[PDB]
Amino acid sequence: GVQVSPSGEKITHTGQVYDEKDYRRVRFVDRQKEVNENFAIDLIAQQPVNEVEHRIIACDGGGGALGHPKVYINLDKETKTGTCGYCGLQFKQH
Amino acid sequence: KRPTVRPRSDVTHKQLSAFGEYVAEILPKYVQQVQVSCLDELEICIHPDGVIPTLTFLRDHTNAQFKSLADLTAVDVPTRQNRFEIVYNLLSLRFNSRIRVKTYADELTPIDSIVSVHIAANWYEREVWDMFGVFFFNHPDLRRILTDYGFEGHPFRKDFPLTGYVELRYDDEVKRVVAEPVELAQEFRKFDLNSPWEAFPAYRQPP
Amino acid sequence: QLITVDEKLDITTLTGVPEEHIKTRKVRIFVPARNNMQSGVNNTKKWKMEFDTRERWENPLMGWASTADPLSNMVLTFSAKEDAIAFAEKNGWSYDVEEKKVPKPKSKSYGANFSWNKRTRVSTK
Amino acid sequence: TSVKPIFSRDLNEAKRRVRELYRAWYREVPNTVHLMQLDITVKQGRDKVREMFMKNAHVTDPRVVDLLVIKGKMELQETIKVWKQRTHVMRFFHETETPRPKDFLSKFYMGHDP
Amino acid sequence: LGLREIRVHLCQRSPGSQGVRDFIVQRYVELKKAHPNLPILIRECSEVQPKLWARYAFGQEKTVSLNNLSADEVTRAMQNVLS
Amino acid sequence: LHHAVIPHGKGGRSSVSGVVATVFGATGFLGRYVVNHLGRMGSQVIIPYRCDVYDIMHLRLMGDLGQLTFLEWDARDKDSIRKAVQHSNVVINLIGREWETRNFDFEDVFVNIPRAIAQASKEAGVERFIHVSHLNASMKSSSKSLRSKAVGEKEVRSVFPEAIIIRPSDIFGREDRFLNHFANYRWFLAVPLVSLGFKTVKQPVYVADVSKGIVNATKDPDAVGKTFAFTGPNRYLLFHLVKYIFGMTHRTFIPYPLPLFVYSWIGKLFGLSPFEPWTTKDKVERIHISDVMPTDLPGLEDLGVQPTPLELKSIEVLRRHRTYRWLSSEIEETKPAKTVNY
Amino acid sequence: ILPGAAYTEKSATYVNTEGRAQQTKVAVTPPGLAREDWKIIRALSEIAGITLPYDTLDQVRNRLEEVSPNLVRYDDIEETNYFQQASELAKLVNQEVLADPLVPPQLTIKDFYMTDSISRASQTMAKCVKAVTE
Ligand SMILES: NC(=O)C1=CN([C@@H]2O[C@H](COP(=O)(O)OP(=O)(O)OC[C@H]3O[C@@H](n4cnc5c(N)ncnc54)[C@H](OP(=O)(O)O)[C@@H]3O)[C@@H](O)[C@H]2O)C=CC1
Ligand SMILES: [Zn+2]
């Protein structure tokens, strides 16, 4: 989501961009502002749901000691789905 | 026997308690509150008038040849009216032991100096005067050591701010390293870390 | 020998501070209130002595919080109150003392929850 | 009341030492503007001496006065010798700090401070 | 020029303020009836020496220290303020 | 009034003032004091430059992080000026040479470059513009510098009204080209002076006063369409001024008269110099025309600055020229200069 | 308009219903060119010809002492009296009471979350209203 403002500046995933009259646009003259193009919101949205069989499962990142602490998510609700606090993966049961 | 905890003996404790009784009953005009800790570190506490006699005793006595000054500290405790707790760590080299002599002071109740006993105390007394503001009588030099020459303040006092009251930078108008007042681009972030739970009942203060 | 000094103990000519932070400044002597998140009370029990807060501002580069006073992060601790008044009168600070706030003792009863006549008969358990 | 002295039975015997110190400074200034090539006149150096003396004239405790005399002797040692440079001496004058406005309305126009 | 406010200052238990309490319970109702539009503030405290302020048109405030007074003399000095 | 323009702080470093400024002659003798006085209290200072990056290093300091932005420009290349003044409230013009070059003439320094910056500033929408002409600047003058400065002072007012035109006298500072210029006439065994220096009057001002005046002019609600005479006190006479210089600098004093035409010819042949020359015809003229009485213009005291007298600051700049045997000598051994009112 | 400061941004006194005077402490300074209220009034005064006597906060507190000395007494509730006098002085006037019921303005919780300036300019209180009314 690197849409620009009318002032030409890139906007960050923390929607930050300086106003037109904000004098702090000087520092980007003969220069640019570092912004990361790979937004984690859209990326983790570009990730499917991992269906499971149980009402309670666990989540680490996938490396074990290289991910995040083990947490358990309930999957009794059907209208919505589970979500991890550390990562943003989603789960559902059939 | 337990591995995680530190081993413990009793003979050092008994020896140091005996030597504490020794000093206490041999030097009663000055001595207060001899104490020996869990870790066996003897610790004698002294009236400020007793400094030269006690230090000369522990240096020159035969059963106490404490003829080496290791440290000479000070400790600011704003609560007590006599703020600065002054400390004298010593060692013997004849008995392979240490001792700690302590006195107290204030901003306007100075203490006799110790160069007449331990010449090592010269620069330490200078450091203590500079850092905490304790004047020492009949000292040869007694100027600053560590602070800048044009410096007002005794920094290691607890009522002194960590960042100070003046800041330096060079100016082209006068071509000198002028001293402007203090203005930081990021305030020091004080963290409130102490937990609201009695961790050690043994030190529980009653009301 | 001794001397008979009458006047108030004063030290400001020794401390090496400016006239500004001595005269302009105000001091709050107090026991801090317990954090209502934690049921613990050990962060109480010691009289502290804070200073008045002053202008902080956004640093124009990154947005950090800046200051022009060095007494901002200043906190002292005293076992009692008169010690704190003494330290402040000695160092030349005008002080405001907030008295000690102690919770009222209270009469608890696990049997009042199961009364025949009273309104303490809780509907739950 | 009922306290120990330092170097002074009373305040007059402290003012004695004060005047000795003022004397040493008055006699030292012309040598300090010469040895390290300060760009001031001897008149305003000595006026600075009297200013930094009258910065502490309210005091009446003899002990405080004796300690101030001690610190003045320290600074005089540092200045008689050249342990301190032109920077430290001209630090006294505040040749870069704009005057703190001693008026209400100016403070109100700039800042929340009293 | 003209009177705009009176305000009475006193204590509840200190005896030097005794005379103002009696004066109040005796004459305050009649005085308010005599001067209904006018206010007269009564603000008491634990330990304060009594006073009696009166404010005229500009910020012109004038006091009398009626500490350890009677009630009749309080009434007399108050009428002196009014007049 | 953007929130980033509000002045926060106790008026010092690492604070904010609201004085986002461009300083075009920043790489010089007066620009350094202007930038120092702008950074001392907290204010972003855009510094357009053409010099090497080596000659902007003393300016790299004197500002907290971010409050000093540099960017290169060319007076010949418009679209390098709007780049600078696009983001500012204030624009300060301190450009000026003491000699022509094969590339830049006097018109192309004192007329066309101010006019360009002023057009760009009126288009950008800045709130103030401080121009720096000369006290003696008049279209009816002998020097090309002064007449060009008159033309520019007029044309800047035409194109950018609500401007500010500061008119200083001969400024003196550590690296000036006035007191050091007089003092460097010792390598030659005598100092020439038209009419022996008499019939010439000089009212010189210290740099820091000029800088403080500019720095307050960019903050005062008044001083929006007004001229200023940054003169300094104590109108001196040129012979006695040079005598005070040569007394503070304890060398000698062998003056002698010299007509203006031969001294001008000397200035010309010294101006045949690919480097920064020493003397020039216009410098001679500007040295030998009296300062105007400022009695009909506001000055420093109407802007918040007490003029520092030259007898208070001369030693700082003239001790560089003293020899051993006279270096460690004080200000009170120089029999100060006779003054005039005229 | 003269921008003032909020309770979070000034040391001030607020008397509660009981009469207890309570002291705020400055936590965050006010933003922009906003300043304290009494500071503004004293500055306006100096701009005019009155130049009110006080110039700091302790002086204004002493003035509060002069007017009502109950206000510098922080956390010290004071025991008033003389209700009988008010009764005798209020029985005199005779104004009928209407045959009108008396409903309060804050009747439901809908009316509770927005009764102020800070409260009315707030997203959380508006959210609570949005929740209750839906
Ligand atoms: N004695 C004095 O200093 C007096 C000065 N003034 C006025 O003060 C102002 C500056 O004085 P001063 O600072 O002494 O001048 P300086 O010569 O000291 O510095 C002038 C600045 O102008 C810049 N400059 C010159 N020509 C050009 C150009 N063609 N294109 C781009 N930049 C250019 C230079 O930048 P670079 O070095 O990168 O070329 C230099 O930094 C002038 O307006 C002058 O009239 C008035 C009276 C006396
Ligand atoms: Zn996860």
Swiss-Prot record, chain A:
One GO biological process term: mitochondrial respiratory chain complex I assembly
Keywords: Acetylation, Electron transport, Membrane, Mitochondrion, Mitochondrion inner membrane, Respiratory chain, Transit peptide, Transport
Its membrane topology: Peripheral membrane protein
Cellular component GO terms, alphabetical: mitochondrial inner membrane; mitochondrion; respiratory chain complex I
Protein location: Mitochondrion inner membrane
Effect of inactivating the gene: Male and female mice are fertile but produce smaller litters and pups have a lower neonatal survival rate. While mice are normal during the first 4 months of life, they are prone to rapid onset weight loss and sudden death after this period. They display cardiomyopathy associated with a doubling of heart weight, impaired systolic function and a reduction in functional capacity. Males are most severely affected, with a propensity to develop cardiac failure and diminished survival after 4 months of age. Defects are due to membrane respiratory chain NADH dehydrogenase (Complex I) deficiency.
Residues annotated with N6-acetyllysine modification: 70, 92
Family assignment from sequence similarity: Belongs to the complex I NDUFS6 subunit family.
Subunit structure: Mammalian complex I is composed of 45 different subunits. This is a component of the iron-sulfur (IP) fragment of the enzyme.
Stated name of the protein: NADH dehydrogenase [ubiquinone] iron-sulfur protein 6, mitochondrial
Shown residues in whole-protein numbering: 21 to 114 of 116
Curated annotation (Swiss-Prot), chain C:
Molecular-function GO terms, alphabetical: NADH dehydrogenase (ubiquinone) activity
Localization, UniProt: Mitochondrion inner membrane
Annotated Gene Ontology cellular component terms: mitochondrial inner membrane; mitochondrion; respiratory chain complex I
Keywords: Electron transport, Membrane, Mitochondrion, Mitochondrion inner membrane, Phosphoprotein, Respiratory chain, Transit peptide, Transport
GO biological process, one term: response to injury involved in regulation of muscle adaptation
Membrane topology qualifier: Peripheral membrane protein
Domain of life: Eukaryota
Residue positions where Phosphoserine is found in the record: 123
Disruption-associated phenotype: Reduces the levels of assembled mitochondrial membrane respiratory chain NADH dehydrogenase (Complex I) and the rate of Complex I-driven oxygen consumption. Growth is retarded although activity and behavior are not affected during the first 4 weeks. With aging, results in increasing lethargy, rapid deterioration of motor ability, weight loss followed by death. Mitochondrial ultrastructure is normal, although large subsarcolemmal clusters of mitochondria are present in the soleus.
Family: Belongs to the complex I NDUFS4 subunit family.
Function recorded in the entry: Accessory subunit of the mitochondrial membrane respiratory chain NADH dehydrogenase (Complex I), that is believed not to be involved in catalysis. Complex I functions in the transfer of electrons from NADH to the respiratory chain. The immediate electron acceptor for the enzyme is believed to be ubiquinone.
Residue numbers of the full-length protein present here: 51 to 175 of 175
Swiss-Prot record, chain D:
Record membrane topology: Peripheral membrane protein
Entry's transmembrane regions: none
GO cellular component: mitochondrial inner membrane; mitochondrion; respiratory chain complex I
Domain of life: Eukaryota
Keywords: Electron transport, Membrane, Mitochondrion, Mitochondrion inner membrane, Respiratory chain, Transport
Main location group: mitochondrion
One GO-annotated biological process of the protein: aerobic respiration
Keyword Mitochondrion: yes
Family per similarity comment: Belongs to the complex I LYR family.
Function as written in the Swiss-Prot or TrEMBL entry: Accessory subunit of the mitochondrial membrane respiratory chain NADH dehydrogenase (Complex I), that is believed to be not involved in catalysis. Required for proper complex I assembly. Complex I functions in the transfer of electrons from NADH to the respiratory chain. The immediate electron acceptor for the enzyme is believed to be ubiquinone.
Protein name in the entry: NADH dehydrogenase [ubiquinone] 1 alpha subcomplex subunit 6
Curated annotation (Swiss-Prot), chain E:
A GO cellular-component term linked to this record: mitochondrial inner membrane
Keyword Transport in annotation: yes
PTM per Swiss-Prot/TrEMBL: Acetylation of Lys-51 and Lys-62 is observed in liver mitochondria from fasted mice but not from fed mice.
Modified residues (N6-acetyllysine): 51, 62
The keyword Mitochondrion is assigned to this record: yes
A Gene Ontology molecular function term of the record: NADH dehydrogenase (ubiquinone) activity
Superkingdom of source: Eukaryota
GO biological process: aerobic respiration; blastocyst hatching; proton motive force-driven mitochondrial ATP synthesis
Disulfide pairings: 11-45
Modification N6-succinyllysine, positions: 51
Localisation: Mitochondrion inner membrane
Membrane topology: Peripheral membrane protein
Keywords assigned by UniProt, alphabetized: Acetylation, Disulfide bond, Electron transport, Membrane, Mitochondrion, Mitochondrion inner membrane, Respiratory chain, Transport
Family stated for the protein in its record: Belongs to the complex I NDUFA2 subunit family.
Role summary: Accessory subunit of the mitochondrial membrane respiratory chain NADH dehydrogenase (Complex I), that is believed not to be involved in catalysis. Complex I functions in the transfer of electrons from NADH to the respiratory chain. The immediate electron acceptor for the enzyme is believed to be ubiquinone.
Assembly and binders: Complex I is composed of 45 different subunits.
The name this protein goes by in its record: NADH dehydrogenase [ubiquinone] 1 alpha subcomplex subunit 2
Residues of the whole record sequence present: 14 to 96 of 99
